[PDB]
Each structure stands twice: as C-alpha cells, then as structure tokens.
Design a binder for this molecule. Structure first.
Ligand SMILES: *[C@@H]1O[C@H](CO)[C@@H](O[C@@H]2O[C@H](CO)[C@@H](O[C@@H]3O[C@H](CO[C@H]4O[C@H](CO[C@@H]5O[C@H](CO)[C@@H](O)[C@H](O)[C@@H]5O[C@H]5O[C@H](CO)[C@@H](O)[C@H](O)[C@@H]5O)[C@@H](O)[C@H](O[C@H]5O[C@H](CO)[C@@H](O)[C@H](O)[C@@H]5O[C@@H]5O[C@H](CO)[C@@H](O)[C@H](O)[C@@H]5O)[C@@H]4O)[C@@H](O)[C@H](O[C@@H]4O[C@H](CO)[C@@H](O)[C@H](O)[C@@H]4O[C@@H]4O[C@H](CO)[C@@H](O)[C@H](O)[C@@H]4O)[C@@H]3O)[C@H](O)[C@H]2NC(C)=O)[C@H](O)[C@H]1NC(C)=O
Ligand SMILES: *[C@@H]1O[C@H](CO)[C@@H](O[C@@H]2O[C@H](CO)[C@@H](O[C@@H]3O[C@H](CO[C@@H]4O[C@H](CO)[C@@H](O)[C@H](O)[C@@H]4O)[C@@H](O)[C@H](O[C@@H]4O[C@H](CO)[C@@H](O)[C@H](O)[C@@H]4O)[C@@H]3O)[C@H](O)[C@H]2NC(C)=O)[C@H](O)[C@H]1NC(C)=O
Length: 408
C-alpha cells in the first residue's frame, strides 16, 4: 500500500520512465530499427514496432538481439544515477508477451520477467519506488507502436482480453506479495487504452473491475492499482470505484503532452504554460488519487520517428497520415542538437518544465517520460539535466511560481 495523497516518501512522486527497454519504441532506440534499412533512400523493410521486429528477424535472431538490448540499455548503474539525481521512483513498461503469447505471436517471451525482477532489485538497492506497468495488451489497446502492435485495436476482443487478463492476474499476484509492497507501490492495469475508440463499459466491467476484485478479494493484498485515464476528460473517473462503495488504493494516471496535435504545437510559450498549470489545478477537484505518469519537456514533435516509423512531424508540416495533414509552424532542423538551440528556446523549455513540475506536484507528483534515449534531447531526462533544461536539484527554479502569476 501507498497513500498517494499523503505518501510515506514525504514528497510527491518524482519519477522517470524506463522507456523503450522491455518494450521497444523506434524513436527511443532508432538504431535497432535502422539496422533493417537496406536503402538509404527509403524505409522499405524497416519494422514499425516490436511485433514486426520479431516477425522479420525470426525467433532466434530476435532473441539474440533483444537479449543484447535488454542486458545493456539499462543496468544497475542507471538506477544509481537516477537516485543520485533526486528521483524517487521508476515506472517500468512491459508487454503482455513477456509472460504469455498468442499462438501466432512472433514475440520473444519468458526472458523479460528476469530483467524486470532485476530492476526491482536495483530500485530497492537505491531506495527507489516502482510502478510495474503493463504497457501492451494482446491485439493492442491503442494501435500505437508503443503498445507493441501499431494500427490494431482488438484489446477488448474476448479472445485477446482473456490472455491479457491472465497475464495481468499473474502480475497482480506476484508483485502484490508482501516482499514487493515496500518497493513496488503501483501496478498499472493497462497503459493508454484508447478510450475514444474502445467500449469503455466493457473495459470497466470486463477488465478493470475484475482486476480489483482479484487483487483485493482473491489475492487479498493492499497493493495500489494504477488506472490510466484512457484519454477521457478530467473527472471522468470520479464515479468509478468510489470510496463510498468501499474501493480504495486506486490511482488515476493522467498523461500530459502538448505536441501531438497542430493546434497544441501552435501555442505560444505563455499558452503552453497556462495549459500546463491548469493540468495541475484541474485534478485538485478529482475524486481519486492521481499522478502524472507521463509528460515531457518537448514543445515540438520533431524528434525522429516520434510519430512512428515512416511519419514526419506536424511542427514543420512534414506529417501526413491518410487524408490527414499538417501545416508548417517552425523548423525541425537539428532539433535535438543543443548546439543549434537559441537562448530563447532554452529559456522556453526550462520555463515549460518548471511549470509542469509545479503543477503536477500540486497533487500526487510526476514521472517524466524517458530517462534516456539514443539521440533525443526533448525526450531525454539525462540530456535535459546535463544542458540545464531540467532542474538539478529537482526543486531548483530559475522561474519560480509561474503558476501563481498568470493573467495576461
Ligand atoms: C543490488 O541489486 C541487485 C538486484 O537484485 C542484486 O543482485 C544480486 O547480487 C547477488 C550478489 O552477487 C547475486 O547473488 C550471487 O549469485 C551468484 C550466481 O548465482 C546464479 O547462478 C546459480 C547457478 O547458475 C545456473 O543456475 C541455473 C538456474 O538454477 C541452472 O540452470 C544452471 O545450470 C546454473 O547452475 C549450475 O551451476 C552452478 C554454479 O556452478 C551450480 O551451483 C549449480 O548446481 C548448477 O550446476 C543459480 O543457482 C542462482 O540462482 C539461484 O539458485 C538457488 C535457487 O535456484 C539459490 O541459491 C538462489 O535462489 C539463487 O538466486 C540467485 O542468487 C541470489 C540468491 O542468493 C538472488 O538474490 C539472485 O536474484 C539470483 O536469483 C543464480 O542465478 C552466486 O554464485 C552467489 O552465491 C554465493 O554463494 C556463497 C557461498 O555459498 C555465499 O556465501 C553467498 O552469500 C552467495 O549466496 C549463497 O548461496 C546461494 C546462492 O546461489 C544463496 O541462495 C544462499 O542464501 C547464500 O547466500 C550469489 O547468490 C544475485 O545473482 C544478483 N541477483 C540479480 C537480480 O542479478 C545485488 O545483490 C544488490 N546489491 C546490493 C548493494 O545490495
Ligand atoms: C469539480 O469536481 C466536480 C466533481 O466533484 C465536477 O463535477 C462532475 O463530477 C462528476 C463526477 O462523477 C463527473 O462525471 C463524469 O462525467 C462524464 C461526462 O462529462 C463529459 O460529458 C460530455 C457529454 O456527454 C462528453 O462529451 C465528455 O467527453 C465528458 O464525458 C462521464 O463521462 C463520466 O463517466 C460516466 O459514467 C456514467 C455511469 O457509468 C456513464 O453512463 C457515462 O457514459 C460516463 O461513462 C462521469 O460521469 C463530471 O464530468 C463533472 N462535471 C463535468 C461535466 O465537468 C466538476 O466538473 C469539477 N469542476 C470543474 C468543471 O473543474
């Protein structure tokens, strides 16, 4: 158990996402996917997600490459660094296939759990809390490449849901045992299910509710469950698993970004800040504990493959999907190279980061998306800190109380 509104840490959650480790994401580790390029002029043959990364290589080759990646992308050293920087928690995404695969799944399985356990040990070793996050469901819960399978939305299909549920129960049972309660203070049932295109009622009654029942009445543990907001507006979950009905230990995970839509990318720095501050004040009125499980310093969607393999960026109007387009806003040239960042851009990012931190710390805390990437700056906590764009110590402020001074 962990009281997110009055945490034993004596401070709000200040974590980092161990992204792209146990679940591959092209923009985080582009070299793994660039390895498939045979023509420097086109993306033909390049897998768009881990599903196809495995399918293309075949079991044996996929296993050896993944093993090299899992054993090196993150090691205990990283967790020591994380702790040395003031963070108090790590969020670890893992796919359902790590534990169980569909008859026709190409995924490498049965090896990721060992690394997950090692990381939990490294976390305990360094006084870091942990969130075990089931980041991918059979058939995909959102069609994002970060679910493992892009452009598929069969999460709630009885056949798939049965597998995902069995895996979730395995996770709930194992990581809710007494020996993990002190370090693992949250198990996220499913990352970013795409609410708008899914049957919300089926997810609630056939996935979320049963999980709570299993954990509290079958396993009988006080472990806290994390429910992603499914992209629904604030207060949407207030009437779900309420305390009045005897439910407890339920935290809503809100993700916050301002780069995945043209109108958002068009905002001035002051508008970006006003929106960030409101993300914080808005949850104060919510009926459940809450933590911002993901946010970034990013103010553009310029980073290579951020919009998945084969797609450009809305920021410089190079993004197009089907009959949907984007329009020019600003340049994406040398986007992630600090040498090409103007003083204005540096200031704006630092301000944006501070406003977000202040806002999210109003209640529950935050977890920055991505401690490390191969070449990104906007999505890389390590690089942001090195370049003075992310606070060190975490309470350091060059632009204090921005959320307390807004009007114009
Ligand atoms: C920071 O956080 C880190 C993350 O948690 C944390 O990491 C941990 O560090 C410790 C310290 O170094 C590591 O422990 C040492 O591990 C050494 C290697 O052991 C591993 O290999 C064993 C054999 O290898 C194969 O195993 C597979 C599977 O069984 C077989 O199929 C193969 O055939 C191999 O076995 C053959 O070969 C063997 C060697 O020739 C032979 O003996 C065997 O008969 C076969 O022929 C493997 O057995 C072992 O796995 C477990 O084995 C049994 C249960 O199956 C138990 O012994 C343990 O459960 C053991 O678990 C592992 O080790 C510890 C438990 O001690 C556990 O925490 C780990 O998570 C891991 O699962 C491993 O896979 C060991 O050689 C070494 O043993 C020492 O022996 C000394 C002499 O007796 C003792 O004085 C030492 O105390 C120490 O441990 C003793 O002996 C047993 C260890 O086997 C203990 O059970 C016993 O209580 C006693 O203490 C260490 O155990 C650990 O691996 C590592 N874990 C992770 C997550 O990576 C780090 O410690 C943290 N640091 C800080 C600052 O806190
Ligand atoms: C201050 O805090 C109070 C709460 O103390 C807020 O007041 C209301 O609090 C309710 C808590 O139960 C909120 O209920 C939710 O309302 C959602 C609907 O809101 C929008 O509706 C439009 C039109 O339908 C949609 O387009 C939007 O996407 C939103 O959904 C519900 O979706 C949500 O869940 C529902 O559950 C029922 C029962 O299972 C289903 O039948 C239904 O289909 C749905 O799944 C839930 O009921 C309520 O939103 C909230 N008031 C609103 C509308 O903001 C104050 O709002 C807070 N003050 C502010 C504004 O900051």
């Amino acid at each position: 158990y962990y009281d997110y509104d009055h945490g034993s840490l004596g401070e709000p959650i200040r974590g980092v996402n161990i992204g792209g480790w146990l679940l591959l994401e092209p923009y985080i580790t582009p070299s793994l996917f660039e390895a498939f390029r045979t023509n420097d002029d086109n993306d033909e043959g390049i897998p768009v997600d881990e599903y196809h990364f495995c399918q293309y290589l075949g079991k044996d080759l996929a296993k050896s490459r993944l093993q090299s990646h899992w054993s090196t992308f993150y090691q205990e050293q990283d967790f020591a660094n994380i702790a040395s920087q003031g963070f108090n928690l790590v969020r670890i995404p893992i796919g359902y296939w790590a534990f169980q695969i569909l008859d026709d799944d190409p995924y490498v399985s049965g090896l990721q759990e060992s690394y997950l356990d090692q990381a939990i040990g490294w976390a305990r070793n360094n006084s870091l809390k942990v969130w075990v996050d089931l980041h991918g469901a059979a058939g995909s819960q959102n069609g994002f490449d970060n679910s493992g399978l892009r452009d598929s939305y069969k999460f709630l299909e009885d056949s798939n849901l049965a597998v995902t549920i069995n895996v979730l129960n395995y996770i709930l049972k194992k990581y809710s045992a007494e020996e993990y309660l002190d370090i693992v203070i949250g198990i996220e049932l499913i990352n970013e299910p795409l609410g708008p295109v899914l049957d919300m009622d089926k997810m609630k009654n056939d996935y979320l509710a049963p999980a709570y029942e299993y954990l509290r009445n079958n396993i009988k543990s006080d472990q806290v469950i994390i429910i992603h907001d499914a992209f629904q507006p604030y207060n949407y979950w207030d009437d779900f698993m309420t305390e009045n009905d005897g439910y407890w230990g339920v935290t809503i995970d809100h993700h916050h970004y301002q780069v995945f839509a043209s109108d958002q990318l068009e905002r001035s720095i002051d508008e970006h800040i006003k929106v960030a501050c409101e993300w914080g004040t808005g949850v104060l009125n919510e009926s459940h504990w809450i933590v911002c499980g993901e946010f970034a310093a990013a103010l553009t969607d310029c980073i290579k493959w951020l919009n998945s393999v084969g797609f450009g960026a809305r920021y410089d109007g190079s993004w197009v999907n089907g009959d949907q387009t984007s329009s020019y806003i600003g340049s994406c040239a040398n986007n992630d190279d600090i040498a090409y960042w103007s003083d204005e851009r540096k200031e704006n990012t630092r301000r944006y980061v501070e406003a977000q931190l202040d806002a999210f710390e109003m209640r529950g805390g935050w977890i920055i998306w991505c401690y490390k990437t191969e070449s990104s700056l906007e999505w890389d906590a390590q690089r942001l800190m090195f370049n003075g764009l992310f606070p060190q110590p975490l309470t350091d402020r060059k632009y204090p109380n921005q959320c307390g001074t807004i009007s114009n």
